[PDB]
Amino acid sequence: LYFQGSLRETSEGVILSVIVAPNARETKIVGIDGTRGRVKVNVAAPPVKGKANKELMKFFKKLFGAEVVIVRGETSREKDLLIKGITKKEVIEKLEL
Template identity: 65%
Template sequence: MIKETKDGVILMLYVSPKAKKNEIDGIDEWRKRLKVKIKAPPVEGKANKEVVKFFSKLFGREVVIIRGETSREKDLLIKGASKEEVKEKLKI
């Protein structure tokens, strides 16, 4: 779910678009991914932009989707972050 790399931390997500609000919704034990609800619909990359915006704001760092542009399962790279910092912010 969280992997440290030389560039930062990779966070593995399972995204549910068209939610009432943007929020972290716990851990999907079966998929081993962090569950995230996003308000935006999954059209024209809107949900992806919302995911990047949400996590950029949360961590105060540059965030990019490195895998899963068209899937609900996404891998995010939080640039320059440490595993401890990510765990602390997510409270996991």
């Protein structure tokens, strides 16, 4: 039930709600924010020229084996990611690895 506060399933896939910090030592999940309902994700890329966005999408596409797009928050730390064609059960399994 830990990651469930950060995601919801629509007809298209799963919307995963994240809050990023760029310039990190490693791209990885570091926690969850209970009030905001977001996964805290550190991103090992600078927030310039879209590079942290690119790294975030690359990281989750690899984890989920599915296309990941930023549907909201391109220029924000709070971003909603659509993981296309995946189920909530599948996303929870992968986040719990």
